[PDB]
Design a protein around this ligand. Structure first.
Ligand SMILES: C[C@H]1CN(c2ccncc2NC(=O)c2ccc(F)c(-c3c(F)cccc3F)n2)C[C@@H](N)[C@@H]1O
Length: 275
């Protein structure tokens, strides 16, 4: 029933502002897992389970979206400790985050970016449909199940319940944050998500993010350092509209002509990954 009984701990996979994440194995069936530790002091956002249990928001959010859809990393279990929480997540194998994948490969071919970006959109739509706002969409928070060509969202530790009124708090990644946050410390959920998705898509097809400093975010002028089709450039600049209400809805993104004829995930692994 206790934690270090149920799970054999492997090596540290990474650590940072989000806590420390370890490789692990469930002792019962040898299922691969990832084990995330977060100190209570560094959790600012605390939700409630139906049954009134105080927990990090992250646990609330992952329970809200943890089902059969494989586009979000599944929370398998969690534990409170006197000074920390521990989360057990599913772990694909082999696996690589999108940041490392892009660092290795450089700018992605458009066919590949289309497939990946499409899966990210399906995953984010599912979160929103379940009342969950991720608030830190970026290559480091997206993982690739290399054998299946399937992407998964991870790290809901900066997320929130989706609402229709203004957010005035933010602790996600600043270079993916929209100009209205930089200037006014205010944003609305969906349109801020769409801006981060513009940053991500640019990142995929150029191999780096378009803006580094506040003043570039605010100016919002996009320069393409690699050859990118006119239709892709158009979608990117739409997502990155300075006025939030000028940005496309998710439906508009998925109906964009650059988004048509997406590869299936398995086709994507065969053409682009196993190779
Ligand atoms: C090591 C990963 C940890 N990661 C996270 C940051 C904040 N919260 C959670 C995570 N990771 C996970 O929740 C998770 C769940 C299942 C996984 F399979 C992985 C994972 C892994 F187990 C190996 C390589 C990468 C992964 F994302 N991470 C950031 C990635 N930039 C890094 O890479």
């Amino acid at each position: 029933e206790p934690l270090e009984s149920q799970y054999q701990v492997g090596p540290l996979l990474g650590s940072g502002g989000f806590g420390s994440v370890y490789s692990g194995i469930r002792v019962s069936d040898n299922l691969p897992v990832a084990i995330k530790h977060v100190e209570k002091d560094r959790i600012s956002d605390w939700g409630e389970l139906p049954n009134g249990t105080r927990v990090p928001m992250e646990v609330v959010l992952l329970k809200k979206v943890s089902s059969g859809f494989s586009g979000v990393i599944r929370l398998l279990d969690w534990f409170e400790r006197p000074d920390s929480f521990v989360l057990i997540l599913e772990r694909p194998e082999p696996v690589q985050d999108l940041f490392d994948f892009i660092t290795e490969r450089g700018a992605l071919q458009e066919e590949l970016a289309r497939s990946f970006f499409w899966q990210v959109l399906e995953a984010v739509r599912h979160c929103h449909n379940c009342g969950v706002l991720h608030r830190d969409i970026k290559d480091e928070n997206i993982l690739i199940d290399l054998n299946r060509g399937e992407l998964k969202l991870i790290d809901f530790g900066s997320g929130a319940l989706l609402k229709d009124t203004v957010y005035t708090d933010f602790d996600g990644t600043r270079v993916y944050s929209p100009p209205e946050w930089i200037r006014y410390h205010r944003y609305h959920g969906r349109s801020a998500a769409v801006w981060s998705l513009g940053i991500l898509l640019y990142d995929m097809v150029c191999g780096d993010i378009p803006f580094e400093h506040d003043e570039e975010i605010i100016r919002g002028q996009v320069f393409f350092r690699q050859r990118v089709s006119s239709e892709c450039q158009h979608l990117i600049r739409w997502c990155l509209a300075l006025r939030p209400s000028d940005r496309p809805t998710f439906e508009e993104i998925q109906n964009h002509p650059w988004m048509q004829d997406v590869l299936l995930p398995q086709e994507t692994a065969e053409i682009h990954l196993h190779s």
